[PDB]
Amino acid sequence: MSVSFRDRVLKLYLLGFDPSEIAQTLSLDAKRKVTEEEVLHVLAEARELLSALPSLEDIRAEVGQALERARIFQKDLLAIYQNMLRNYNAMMEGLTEHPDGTPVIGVRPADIAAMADRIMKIDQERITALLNSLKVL
């Protein structure tokens, strides 16, 4: 009723189950039975936990993490963009397969422009959010 129960009742409530069903699914989890009031006590308890206010350094944690979310995605998209631009040249020469024998998938030229715009969008998002971190905080 401390860690893996207070987490589970909160997570199962936010996916839209009434506290009757939250009890019945957890009635067979570990215990013999879980009463509805046992569920409903935790939901009101965890409500006030979530009702707290952040700190100024607490906000700096996500803005640190959100920009690092971006850099992981740019390592993925630039790997795609190079490997998509590979298929555009090999399609143009008429090669049905790459020299590695791997198949050549068709890529339109307006599709490469889409992935170019996605990358520079992310790179522009770093500059804007980092500047607001300096400005607001």
By CB under 8 A, what part of segment 19-78 binds a copy of itself?
Answer: 47, 49-54, 56-70, 72-78
Closer CB to a copy of itself, residue 10 or residue 27? 10
Q: How far is the CB of 71 from a copy of itself (least distance, A)?
A: 9
Q: Which of 6, 24, 40, 119 binds a copy of itself (CB under 8 A)?
A: 119
Number of residues that bind a copy of itself (CB under 8 A): 76
Token pair listed for 131:
């500047």
Q: How far is the CB of 57 from a copy of itself (least distance, A)?
A: 6
- Computed on alpha carbons and rounded to an integer, the radius of gyration of the chain in Å comes to 25
Closer CB to a copy of itself, residue 32 or residue 134? 134
DSSP string, the chain: --STTHHHHHHHHHTT--HHHHHHHHHTTTSS---HHHHHHHHHHHHHHHT----HHHHHHHHHHHHHHHHHHHHHHHHHHHHHHHHHHHHHHT-SB-TTSPBPPP--HHHHHHHHHHHHHHHHHHHHHHHHHHHH-
Closer CB to a copy of itself, residue 24 or residue 115? 115
Per-residue contact flags (x/-) with a copy of itself for residues 79 to 108, judged by CB under 8 A: xxxxxxx--x--xxxx-------xx-x-x-
1 binds a copy of itself (CB under 8 A): no
